[PDB]
Amino acid sequence: HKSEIAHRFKDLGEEHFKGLVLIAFSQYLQQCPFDEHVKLVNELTEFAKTCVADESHAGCEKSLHTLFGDELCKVASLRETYGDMADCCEKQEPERNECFLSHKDDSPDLPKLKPDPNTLCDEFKADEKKFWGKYLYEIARRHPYFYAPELLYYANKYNGVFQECCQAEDKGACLLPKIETMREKVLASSARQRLRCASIQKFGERALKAWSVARLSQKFPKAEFVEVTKLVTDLTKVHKECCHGDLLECADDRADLAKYICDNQDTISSKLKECCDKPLLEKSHCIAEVEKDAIPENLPPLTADFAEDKDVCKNYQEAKDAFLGSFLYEYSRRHPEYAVSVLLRLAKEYEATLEECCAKDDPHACYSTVFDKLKHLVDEPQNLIKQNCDQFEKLGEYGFQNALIVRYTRKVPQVSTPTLVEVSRSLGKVGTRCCTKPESERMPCTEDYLSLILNRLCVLHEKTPVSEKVTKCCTESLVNRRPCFSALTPDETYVPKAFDEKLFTFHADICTLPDTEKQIKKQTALVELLKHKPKATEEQLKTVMENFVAFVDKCCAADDKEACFAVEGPKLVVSTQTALA
Numbered sequence: 001h002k003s004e005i006a007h008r009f010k011d012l013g014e015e016h017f018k019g020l021v022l023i024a025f026s027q028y029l030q031q032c033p034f035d036e037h038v039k040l041v042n043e044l045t046e047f048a049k050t051c052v053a054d055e056s057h058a059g060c061e062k063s064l065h066t067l068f069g070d071e072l073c074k075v076a077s078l079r080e081t082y083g084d085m086a087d088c089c090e091k092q093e094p095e096r097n098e099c100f101l102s103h104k105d106d107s108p109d110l111p112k113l114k115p116d117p118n119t120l121c122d123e124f125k126a127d128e129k130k131f132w133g134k135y136l137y138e139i140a141r142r143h144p145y146f147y148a149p150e151l152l153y154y155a156n157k158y159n160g161v162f163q164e165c166c167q168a169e170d171k172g173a174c175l176l177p178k179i180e181t182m183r184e185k186v187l188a189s190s191a192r193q194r195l196r197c198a199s200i201q202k203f204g205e206r207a208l209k210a211w212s213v214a215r216l217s218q219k220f221p222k223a224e225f226v227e228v229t230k231l232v233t234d235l236t237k238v239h240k241e242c243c244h245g246d247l248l249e250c251a252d253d254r255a256d257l258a259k260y261i262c263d264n265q266d267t268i269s270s271k272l273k274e275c276c277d278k279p280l281l282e283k284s285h286c287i288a289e290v291e292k293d294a295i296p297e298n299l300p301p302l303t304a305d306f307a308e309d310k311d312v313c314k315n316y317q318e319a320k321d322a323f324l325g326s327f328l329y330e331y332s333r334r335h336p337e338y339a340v341s342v343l344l345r346l347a348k349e350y351e352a353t354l355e356e357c358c359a360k361d362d363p364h365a366c367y368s369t370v371f372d373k374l375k376h377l378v379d380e381p382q383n384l385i386k387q388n389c390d391q392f393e394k395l396g397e398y399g400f401q402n403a404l405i406v407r408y409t410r411k412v413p414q415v416s417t418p419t420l421v422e423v424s425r426s427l428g429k430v431g432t433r434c435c436t437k438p439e440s441e442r443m444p445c446t447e448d449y450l451s452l453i454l455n456r457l458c459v460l461h462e463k464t465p466v467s468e469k470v471t472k473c474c475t476e477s478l479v480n481r482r483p484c485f486s487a488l489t490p491d492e493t494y495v496p497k498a499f500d501e502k503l504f505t506f507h508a509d510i511c512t513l514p515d516t517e518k519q520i521k522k523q524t525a526l527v528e529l530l531k532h533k534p535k536a537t538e539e540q541l542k543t544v545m546e547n548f549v550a551f552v553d554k555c556c557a558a559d560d561k562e563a564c565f566a567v568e569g570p571k572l573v574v575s576t577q578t579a580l581a
């Protein structure tokens with residue numbers, strides 16, 4: 001094979017080749033109009049056709065990053081719009097590509113889409129193919145690390161909603177409830193993908209490799225270790241390419257793995273027949289959301305192969321990761337009730353056991369009791385679930401988010417205000433997703449979602465590092481972030497921020513902004529309130545909130561709102577400064 005660009009074009013097809021390139025251009029340059037990206041895709045698509053016809057043509061043998069970076073460099077508004085990004089084109093490959101990835105903005109500050117069904121159903125009937133591309137460009141631009149093959153899946157499921165709803169008598173009643181249930185699934189899928197790339201770039205290939213061992217052995221307990229390692233090797237490669245910008249190699253390798261899984265169902269799992277009958281994009285998504293398989297009937301006891309064996313040390317030193325991956329496989333297949341975050345926590349703790357036990361003269365007496373130490377790790381988080389869920393039912397979602405806003409602001413005051421608000425909102429959403437679930441299967445729920453939300457706090461904070469407490473928990477370990485953040489305490493080393501009148505100034509626009517925007521504004525002032533008064537008790541903060549609610553209710557109803565906010569505004573500040581002094 002001499003032409004990489006022709007190999008990807010023939011395997012994926014024109015439609016999927018064009019979409020994946022549009023996604024790639026959207027993640028690299030997030031401040032560019034949609035029309036300009038269509039031109040870059042069309043030009044690169046025409047070049048791809050030429051290489052398939054004639055492979056010996058000049059330029060067909062270059063790497064996919066070279067051709068990609070070459071087109072990114074011809075953007076006339078590279079410097080004036082992206083600043084220092086224009087200096088990436090002054091280097092060679094692969095340093096040129098690494099320079100580009102480093103400029104992916106995880107907070108693109110892009111406008112919020114307010115979709116109305118009238119004009120939205122109109123653009124779909126006008127051009128379904130462009131309305132399809134507009135969704136890809138819009139999602140990829142706000143999530144520059146999105147799993148690209150799944151972006152095409154959601155894009156086709158997006159037209160499918162309009163396919164069925166733009167024909168009914170009430171388009172609004174049909175479209176909005178479907179896209180909202182889909183809006184939460186895409187943000188969930190983006191946060192999961194954002195954590196996978198973070199594992200590689202910050203904790204190494206071994207981190208993502210062990211991630212798949214936990215999930216795969218959990219979902220496929222019947223598959224033997226040699227089969228699980230085969231899938232792990234190819235899946236880690238697939239994700240490694242997507243997280244590295246090789247979207248064409250990523251999707252093509254996902255299809256090959258989706259095909260390999262179906263052609264070996266009898267050795268992997270018995271619940272894939274329905275999954276292995278859908279089209280390419282739907283099939284790959286089915287395998288990712290498939291139910292777990294049944295546990296074998298006569299599994300040998302765990303203690304046999306890694307505790308009572310007089311060769312645990314010997315087997316470990318000859319193949320450390322392979323023996324440890326074996327321990328994760330044996331443990332994940334028998335405990336599908338646990339969280340993936342808990343399994344990697346059990347294996348990481350077992351790793352630390354062998355390293356210190358084999359160092360002793362008689363490791364046998366040292367490592368023989370590891371089973372008791374590991375079992376105690378499962379019960380440590382259990383106490384936090386009850387307390388959080390009880391506070392959830394009492395205050396509700398909104399009252400819980402403001403509760404977490406208070407708890408986490410005193411915990412890490414140095415973190416910027418918009419990050420503290422947005423994170424605490426996601427933390428409050430966890431209660432609605434987990435405490436209502438079975439208390440005998442919810443245990444992973446909390447631990448699972450918390451690892452995806454705390455990762456975003458690290459991702460947001462690593463851009464502009466300002467808090468010493470956040471940096472430690474984010475770089476110490478990947479699996480122990482949740483206990484590292486719950487164990488943090490409000491430190492008396494933080495000096496309260498000086499008072500800012502603007503941070504407590506409000507206009508009549510508070511009565512107009514959308515509901516989400518209204519809450520954000522009210523929650524922003526709550527963060528800045530505690531940043532200035534870090535020692536305000538709960539009874540005082542209770543009084544201030546009720547004083548503000550009755551206030552905003554008063555001024556949003558007067559015939560002259562600006563005069564109400566002008567007069568009553570200073571009144572609240574004096575009363576609040578008096579109660580908090």
Ligand SMILES: COCCOCCOCC[n+]1ccc(/C=C/c2ccc3cc(N(C)C)ccc3c2)cc1
Pocket residue numbers: none
């Ligand atoms: C403030 O000025 C804004 C300018 O921004 C430019 C961004 O600066 C970054 C650092 N940097 C500095 C200089 C250059 C250009 C060198 C050059 C180019 C074309 C040339 C063509 C020639 N011909 C044969 C006609 C002869 C010499 C050339 C020499 C590029 C980048």
Ligand SMILES: COCCOCCOCC[n+]1ccc(/C=C/c2ccc3cc(N(C)C)ccc3c2)cc1
Pocket residue numbers: 304305315319322323326
């Ligand atoms: C590079 O790879 C990583 C490094 O490998 C490290 C792996 O070490 C050996 C792991 N291991 C392998 C096999 C077994 C079970 C054996 C067994 C089976 C049936 C049995 C039937 C019996 N009956 C009489 C009914 C009696 C005993 C039996 C015993 C346990 C542990």
